[PDB]
Amino acid sequence: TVRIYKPAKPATQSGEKNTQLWRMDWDVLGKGHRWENPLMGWQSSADFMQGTHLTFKTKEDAIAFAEKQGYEYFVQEPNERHFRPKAYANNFLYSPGKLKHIRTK
Amino acid sequence: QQFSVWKDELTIYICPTGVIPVFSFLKYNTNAEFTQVSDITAVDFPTREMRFEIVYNLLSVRHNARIRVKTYADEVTPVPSITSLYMGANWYEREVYD
Amino acid sequence: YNRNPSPGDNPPLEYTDPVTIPAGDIADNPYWKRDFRRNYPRPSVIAQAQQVALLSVGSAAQPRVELIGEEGTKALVAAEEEGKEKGVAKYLEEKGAEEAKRVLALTGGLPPTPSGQTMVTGQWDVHKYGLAEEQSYGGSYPCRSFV
Amino acid sequence: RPSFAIARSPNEQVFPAGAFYESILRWNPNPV
Amino acid sequence: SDTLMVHRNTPENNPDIPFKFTPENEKIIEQILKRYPPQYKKAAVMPLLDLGQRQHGFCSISVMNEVARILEMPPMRVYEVASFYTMYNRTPVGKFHVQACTTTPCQLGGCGSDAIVKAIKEHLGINQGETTPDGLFTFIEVECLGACVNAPMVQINDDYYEDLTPETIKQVLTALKESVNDVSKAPKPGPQSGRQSCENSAGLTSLTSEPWGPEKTRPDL
Amino acid sequence: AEVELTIDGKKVSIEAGSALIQACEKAGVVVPRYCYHEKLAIAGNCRMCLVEVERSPKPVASCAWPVQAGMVVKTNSPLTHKAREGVMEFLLANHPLDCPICDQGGECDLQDQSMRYGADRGRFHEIGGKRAVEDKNIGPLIKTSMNRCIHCTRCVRFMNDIAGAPELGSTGRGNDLQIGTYLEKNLDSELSGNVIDLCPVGALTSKPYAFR
Amino acid sequence: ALRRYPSGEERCIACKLCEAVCPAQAITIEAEERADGSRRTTRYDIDMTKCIYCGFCQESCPVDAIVESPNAEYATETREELLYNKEKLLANGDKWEPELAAAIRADAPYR
Amino acid sequence: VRTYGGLKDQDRIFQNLYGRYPPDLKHAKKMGDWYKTKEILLKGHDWIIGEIKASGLRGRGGAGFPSGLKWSFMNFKDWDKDNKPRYLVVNADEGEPGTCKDREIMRKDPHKLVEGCLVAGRAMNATAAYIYIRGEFYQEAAILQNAINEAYAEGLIGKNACGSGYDFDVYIHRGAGAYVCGEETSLIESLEGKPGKPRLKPPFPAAVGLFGCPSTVANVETVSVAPTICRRGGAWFASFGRERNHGTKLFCISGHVNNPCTVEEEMSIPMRELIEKHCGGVRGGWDNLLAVIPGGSSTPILPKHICDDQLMDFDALKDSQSGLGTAAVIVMDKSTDVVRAISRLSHFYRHESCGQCTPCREGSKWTDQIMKRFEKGMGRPREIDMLQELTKQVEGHTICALGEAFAWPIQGLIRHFRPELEARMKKFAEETGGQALAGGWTHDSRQKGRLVSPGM
Ligand SMILES: Cc1cc2nc3c(=O)[nH]c(=O)nc-3n(C[C@H](O)[C@H](O)[C@H](O)COP(=O)(O)O)c2cc1C
Ligand code: SF4
Ligand code: SF4
Ligand code: SF4
Ligand code: SF4
Ligand code: SF4
Numbered sequence A: 001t002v003r004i005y006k007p008a009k010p011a012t013q014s015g016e017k018n019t020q021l022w023r024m025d026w027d028v029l030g031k032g033h034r035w036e037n038p039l040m041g042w043q044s045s046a047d048f049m050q051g052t053h054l055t056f057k058t059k060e061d062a063i064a065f066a067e068k069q070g071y072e073y074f075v076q077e078p079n080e081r082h083f084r085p086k087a088y089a090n091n092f093l094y095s096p097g098k099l100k101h102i103r104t105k
Numbered sequence B: 001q002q003f004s005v006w007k008d009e010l011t012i013y014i015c016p017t018g019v020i021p022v023f024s025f026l027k028y029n030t031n032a033e034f035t036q037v038s039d040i041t042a043v044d045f046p047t048r049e050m051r052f053e054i055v056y057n058l059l060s061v062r063h064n065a066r067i068r069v070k071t072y073a074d075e076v077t078p079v080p081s082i083t084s085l086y087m088g089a090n091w092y093e094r095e096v097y098d
Numbered sequence C: 001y002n003r004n005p006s007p008g009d010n011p012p013l014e015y016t017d018p019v020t021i022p023a024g025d026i027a028d029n030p031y032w033k034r035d036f037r038r039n040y041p042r043p044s045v046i047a048q049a050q051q052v053a054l055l056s057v058g059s060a061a062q063p064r065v066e067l068i069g070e071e072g073t074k075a076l077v078a079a080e081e082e083g084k085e086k087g088v089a090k091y092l093e094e095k096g097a098e099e100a101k102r103v104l105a106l107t108g109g110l111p112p113t114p115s116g117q118t119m120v121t122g123q124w125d126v127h128k129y130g131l132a133e134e135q136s137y138g139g140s141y142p143c144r145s146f147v
Numbered sequence D: 001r002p003s004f005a006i007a008r009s010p011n012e013q014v015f016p017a018g019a020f021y022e023s024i025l026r027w028n029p030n031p032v
Numbered sequence E: 001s002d003t004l005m006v007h008r009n010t011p012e013n014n015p016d017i018p019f020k021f022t023p024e025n026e027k028i029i030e031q032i033l034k035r036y037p038p039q040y041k042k043a044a045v046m047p048l049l050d051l052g053q054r055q056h057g058f059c060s061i062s063v064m065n066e067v068a069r070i071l072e073m074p075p076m077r078v079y080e081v082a083s084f085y086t087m088y089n090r091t092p093v094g095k096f097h098v099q100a101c102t103t104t105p106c107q108l109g110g111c112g113s114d115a116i117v118k119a120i121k122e123h124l125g126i127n128q129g130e131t132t133p134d135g136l137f138t139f140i141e142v143e144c145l146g147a148c149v150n151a152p153m154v155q156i157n158d159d160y161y162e163d164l165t166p167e168t169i170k171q172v173l174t175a176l177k178e179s180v181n182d183v184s185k186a187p188k189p190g191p192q193s194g195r196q197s198c199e200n201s202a203g204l205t206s207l208t209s210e211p212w213g214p215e216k217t218r219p220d221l
Numbered sequence F: 001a002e003v004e005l006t007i008d009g010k011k012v013s014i015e016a017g018s019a020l021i022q023a024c025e026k027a028g029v030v031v032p033r034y035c036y037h038e039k040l041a042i043a044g045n046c047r048m049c050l051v052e053v054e055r056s057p058k059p060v061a062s063c064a065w066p067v068q069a070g071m072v073v074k075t076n077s078p079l080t081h082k083a084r085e086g087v088m089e090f091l092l093a094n095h096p097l098d099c100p101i102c103d104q105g106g107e108c109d110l111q112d113q114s115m116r117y118g119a120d121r122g123r124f125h126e127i128g129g130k131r132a133v134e135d136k137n138i139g140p141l142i143k144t145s146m147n148r149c150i151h152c153t154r155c156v157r158f159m160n161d162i163a164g165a166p167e168l169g170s171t172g173r174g175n176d177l178q179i180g181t182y183l184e185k186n187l188d189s190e191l192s193g194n195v196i197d198l199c200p201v202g203a204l205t206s207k208p209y210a211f212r
Numbered sequence G: 001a002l003r004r005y006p007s008g009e010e011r012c013i014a015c016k017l018c019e020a021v022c023p024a025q026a027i028t029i030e031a032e033e034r035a036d037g038s039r040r041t042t043r044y045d046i047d048m049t050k051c052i053y054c055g056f057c058q059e060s061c062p063v064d065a066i067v068e069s070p071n072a073e074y075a076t077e078t079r080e081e082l083l084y085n086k087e088k089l090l091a092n093g094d095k096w097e098p099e100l101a102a103a104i105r106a107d108a109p110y111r
Numbered sequence H: 001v002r003t004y005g006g007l008k009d010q011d012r013i014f015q016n017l018y019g020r021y022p023p024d025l026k027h028a029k030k031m032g033d034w035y036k037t038k039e040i041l042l043k044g045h046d047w048i049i050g051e052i053k054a055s056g057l058r059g060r061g062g063a064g065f066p067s068g069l070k071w072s073f074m075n076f077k078d079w080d081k082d083n084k085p086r087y088l089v090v091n092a093d094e095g096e097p098g099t100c101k102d103r104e105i106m107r108k109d110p111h112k113l114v115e116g117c118l119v120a121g122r123a124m125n126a127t128a129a130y131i132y133i134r135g136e137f138y139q140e141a142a143i144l145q146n147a148i149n150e151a152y153a154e155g156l157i158g159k160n161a162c163g164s165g166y167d168f169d170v171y172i173h174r175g176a177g178a179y180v181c182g183e184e185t186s187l188i189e190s191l192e193g194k195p196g197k198p199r200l201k202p203p204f205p206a207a208v209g210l211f212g213c214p215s216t217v218a219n220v221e222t223v224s225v226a227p228t229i230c231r232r233g234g235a236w237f238a239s240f241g242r243e244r245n246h247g248t249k250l251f252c253i254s255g256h257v258n259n260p261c262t263v264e265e266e267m268s269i270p271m272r273e274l275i276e277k278h279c280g281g282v283r284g285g286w287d288n289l290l291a292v293i294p295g296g297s298s299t300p301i302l303p304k305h306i307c308d309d310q311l312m313d314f315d316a317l318k319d320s321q322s323g324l325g326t327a328a329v330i331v332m333d334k335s336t337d338v339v340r341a342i343s344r345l346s347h348f349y350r351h352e353s354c355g356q357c358t359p360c361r362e363g364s365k366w367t368d369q370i371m372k373r374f375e376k377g378m379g380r381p382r383e384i385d386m387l388q389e390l391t392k393q394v395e396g397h398t399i400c401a402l403g404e405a406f407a408w409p410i411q412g413l414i415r416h417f418r419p420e421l422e423a424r425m426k427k428f429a430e431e432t433g434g435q436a437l438a439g440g441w442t443h444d445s446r447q448k449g450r451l452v453s454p455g456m
């Protein structure tokens, strides 16, 4: 099974460059993805698809390629931000009552 | 279908059926004497329905010029061989097929 | 004389890493003025619809008609939708042989010639291969020196 | 090492409060 | 100089020592809180830090903690105010806080403000930053104190001794030093060398005639 | 009541009272930022998002500027190019040369926007050197390397407004303004490790993750 | 070879720049905080049967930790002898350091 | 055709500049203060705004914004359809090097400031006036509050201001040692119990200010004249100084003059006339004057060849790429180091930056370090152009104007004293053995095994 999804924006950065395209990725199997090589401690693999991913402009393209090759696939739709307007002046609203929170710039 | 100019490189975009007529014209026309095939290769674009882009690079020694011709292909849609117009094209097409 | 001194005993203090002062100044070089990577040319793409429009109403360097403000903006977009609907072939076929002569009239009557790839003479052109005044083999061997 | 000015007793005023802070206990927003 | 922007836990400085405002000092606070909107009690943090400084000697973390408790501010919000404003002595000081203005106007004006520091540094024998072994004079340079026409000048606790000369500042410290025993020996505030506040030392060029009052006014009320 | 405005010559519509940076994101225009985060209060202190607005003499903070009925915004003019280069220069003047030893390396917005919007070389060569600041203990989860701090205020705004833990703040003034708890204490929030991600720099990093 | 400071501390701080730039993926690194809290490696292996001897690691290293020695006469009986771990590389740096410093001394102006 | 300057005592305003009277109300009432305060209150708030507009009065805190327009921002469309209080904030902060006028008003004639807040408050319909006095002015705050208590006791201010039916409160808030708190938003945030970090504007205090309410911030001097403006007339004030620079100005003269003092004078006065007939001239004569800073350290330096024929107002000082500022005149004779006098100012600003924004918190420290190196000539001349462009990317890129306050003085010194900067770079090179690298390192740094990058 391949996964078809839009990669989420990393929580560590504000750049959204890697969220623009659709990614096709192979799910890791229960056995054979990784194991420790006894000699060096390196990480061996039996999964020839482990380092392979495909990039698509639209998910219909990704689905079309997956149907054509015969991959089982699962489509994960992207979570979208819920818009809410933001205003700098809201940091300084008048409080008719108990302050309820003390702001620090 | 279209042409594009980037810096000094002219690319010509054609439908697969016209491969023989277009390269005949580029070989034999008096104002297009691209009598050598520099290179034939392919690029893969899985997001495209015609996933394979076929790229031909030609050389005109008489006019000291180069041209690029692009067509497209699929897993089951062939392209006309240009071996009847260019002997050098024989191994380049085997490489694209391989 | 040969490799004396050894490069491993070249005094390190003598060599100076050079810096060109426009690119390496501390005062008058903003990066964006020399950022030639981000000023890369986009490919200029012309489809069949665009050439029909370029034939119907000319270009910005040379228009075909006046196209003055109103009734010209709609006239200009007419040349676009016509280009989309009928390609170059159908356009020429309706207009006839005179249009065909007009396409060659763009290139001065004769069809154009491919651009050359050397600018030594100042213009793009073929390289004018000619026999060198000094033939290295003279004439005693079947090899000729071209300059 | 050097001794400083810290209130040794909890009811000690280290620094005189000041003229400005006496004109606050004298402040009265009602006319006489 | 070497003022830290983080707390350092010392036997004279930790949350363990309790601070309470005196019953006399609480009366001041009650009037202070009256002059702000009640839900913006936190606007009185600057006044109340000043009172804790005057009662305790310095702005200790304990004064900071009690000020926060009175105004129900989180203590970090009080730590931010106290560390942003330089008048809050978050480290203990001596009895007298000598503060010499060394911004450019005082540097230039009258005698060199360099000389006032030179006099001060030889009267107490300590550089900028530290306090005398007797603990009567902590000395530091400060920024423009607002008395530039009277340059050079100096502040000690709440006073602007101005129009200074290396001998004049020298004798001021003595008068302040002897004042710890007899109150009447304290030096007079203001500028020295005869000048009153800011007028010309060579006679008034203005405000010589009798002042005008309400006798002249626009006739239309 | 979506107003209509122009950014880089292309029209975008957005609700009134929205910040200009929100309209740029809606229009697909990329605007550099450090202090601004969609989930935090607007700060306006980093100066990275300055853009050219017609009928506005000073370049403007696109995170704090409200959208209007007919404004025209130029985010790729020489003025915008000059603002980003200058602000990046100030951000890097005192920034420590620690990317080999910093855990943000490879996922750093200061490195990525220096490569994208800044110059290629630095001009800070002062003999007096850089600012250096002492490290702070704020619990077992967050390793601090406070020289890397760029004073965006994201960790204070999150800890105060979002997490309800008003123990993180900033003390001092000027170049010596320092983020931390004024007295070393554990940060008592079960949401504390969100500051590690919010931090654009590696000033607040995960202690268990350190160097791995 | 892996190099030290004059004090004997390791030059390597586990930046992973050499592991990332390596055109042949010949370097494998693991790292954590050392007992003293220093950023150091726990694994530093170079597969000498993957390495193309291009100097990219030495160019990428910000502390001059990884270098190529002038030595070329180390042919081995078995292939396993060409799987260098951190012990083998630090021993190589200890033995070759005067050459390593001399080569760095001569060419550092051009680097 | 007419020369401005030398206004007579009968046409002054601050008749107590030199402390001839106690600050009590007895003497204040003798001087016209609190004379017709009731009638002025009963007049419409449009009338007071018109009178301040007519006088041509501009803000005296440094910016020169016309006061009548400024105070009119507060009377927006529907100011009467809300329950929020409305605040007048007198800026009695005074951290600008050179100026001393504000302390004099507060200690010589407090009741002009108290009667100004009342008058200025009714023009913009404020419920309370807050006076923010710098915390080192401890004595002046005491005298101001004593007047406030006495004004409170007479019914002059409070519930029924002079019997006019106008509720108004006047309060004192002391600062605690920050020059940034004289900024308008920094003052507002300092008043609310926060570090004095300026706010960004669009939120404009007229809309959202102190405690989130409509607030106007006005300098001490521009408030203390509004009542005597109305009592004498806007036309009377719009007769001194040039067309857009009207009225009288408090000039604080300091530095290398024989008698530094504080005198009231007239806008558009020749600068030379002001120093010579009120401060005894320049030390060593007018021919000994090297340069002066006209309006406080935030304004650029002016050299002799322009100081000869310079008028003291906004427009003229702007024409010579300087500013009137707070009329704080600091003069240097020929026996000074002008670079050191400006390096001290760069050190002033590095200590006064709040640290909120990047170009100022980092730029002020950076420019200060370069200024220290420029004292000793420890750099190459191309770094002078580097410093000039550093100031340019600070300028206009900051949240508040403290950023210009430290960019302009450096620009003025580069503009007018570059050879002096070039000179000591020559001297320092003549000693070390070569031109110094960028950043202050000696020519021979690479020889001595220092870390030196190409292009430095
Ligand atoms: C850094 C800085 C410091 C300032 N300090 C003062 C000050 O001490 N007093 C003052 O009246 N204005 C000061 N200002 C100017 C004020 O922001 C404001 O223009 C003035 O207080 C009120 O305007 P007005 O002059 O029209 O009354 C300062 C401005 C800045 C940027
Ligand atoms: S925070 Fe970014 S720029 Fe600074 S050291 Fe870490 S990775 Fe490098
Ligand atoms: S520690 Fe990080 S998140 Fe907090 S202010 Fe500094 S850079 Fe921003
Ligand atoms: S050898 Fe150098 S580049 Fe590789 S991890 Fe160690 S320090 Fe980083
Ligand atoms: S020399 Fe070997 S280990 Fe170093 S980068 Fe090249 S291939 Fe990788
Ligand atoms: S310009 Fe300076 S004082 Fe003003 S907000 Fe920025 S850092 Fe603070």
Ligand code: FES
Pocket (backbone or CB within 6 Å): E101, E102, E103, E104, E105, E106, E107, E143, E144, E145, E146, E147, E148, E151, E153, H097, H098, H099
């Ligand atoms: S400069 Fe020293 S008091 Fe103003």
Ligand code: FES
Pocket (backbone or CB within 6 Å): F032, F033, F034, F035, F036, F043, F044, F045, F046, F047, F048, F049, F050, F061, F062, F063, F064
């Ligand atoms: S993102 Fe707008 S100023 Fe930081």
